[PDB]
């Protein structure tokens, strides 16, 4: 059944994310009441969808901390909307890893953001406002990319929906 499987896949992702240590396929099989082989197939499927799962000798590993899935998002906004954009992403369950923006000298520059909570967003903005350099998001008409991570596709989808509602997304 399609629904039975969607439920098992969601559980696998949650179990792997919650766990600090690797979780063996035998344990996932025991915990989900399916054969070891069903787990091998589920994991291959989850990976082809984008889940950053790795099979190590001691078990499957999938980073908790909202880093299950990753995606490049094309957005467009002024430097003053940075806070709004980050809050929109962290409040919806994800994290912003970095920013890529075209530059007239270096082709493109990649900067680090690394925020996954409202407090980190506020520390980033505060930190940014206290600094005295030229803004980067003034470059390229405000067009830039962000690598966004999320616990799962459902969450990633919610994040894209919200960014769209705020008019940040570039769509063509």
Binding-site residue positions: 77, 85, 144, 146
Task: Sketch the per residue contact string, 78 through 107, with Ni ion: x for CB under 5 A, - otherwise.
Answer: -------x----------------------
**Closest CB to Ni ion among residues 85, 152:** 85
What span, in angstroms and rounded, lies between the C-alpha atoms of 80 and 135? 10
Among residues 21, 22, 39, 40, the alpha carbon closest in space to that of 30 is found at 39
How far apart (Å, rounded) are the C-alpha atoms in residues 34 and 27? Answer: 10
Out of 64, 111, 141, 167, the only residue in the binding site for K ion (CB under 5 A) is 64
CB atoms within 10 A of CB 91: 13
- Tell me which of K ion, Ni ion, none is bound by residue 64, counting a contact when its beta carbon lies within the kind-specific cut-off of 5 to 8 angstroms: K ion
65 binds, among Ni ion, K ion, none (CB under 5 to 8 A by kind): none
Question: Is residue 153 at the binding interface for Ni ion, with CB under 5 A as the rule?
Answer: no
72 backbone dihedrals φ, ψ, rounded to 5°: -90, 130
Residues lying near Ni ion in the complex (CB under 5 A): 85
């Amino acid at each position: 059944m399609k629904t039975v499987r969607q439920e098992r896949l969601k559980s696998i992702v949650r179990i792997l994310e919650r766990s600090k240590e690797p979780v063996s396929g035998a344990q996932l099989a025991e915990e989900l009441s399916v054969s070891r082989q069903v787990i091998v197939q589920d994991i291959a499927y989850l990976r082809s969808l984008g889940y950053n799962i790795v099979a190590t000798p001691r078990g499957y590993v999938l980073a908790g901390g909202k880093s299950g899935v990753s995606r490049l998002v094309a957005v467009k906004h002024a430097p003053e909307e940075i806070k709004e954009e980050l809050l929109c992403v962290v409040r919806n369950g994800g994290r912003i890893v970095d920013v890529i923006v075209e530059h007239p000298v270096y082709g493109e520059i990649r900067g680090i953001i690394d925020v996954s909570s409202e407090e980190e967003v506020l520390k980033f903005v505060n930190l940014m406002e206290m600094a005295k350099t030229e803004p980067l998001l003034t470059l390229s008409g405000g067009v830039h990319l962000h690598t966004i991570e999320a616990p799962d596709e459902e969450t990633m989808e919610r994040i894209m929906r919200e960014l769209k509602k705020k008019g940040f997304l570039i769509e063509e």
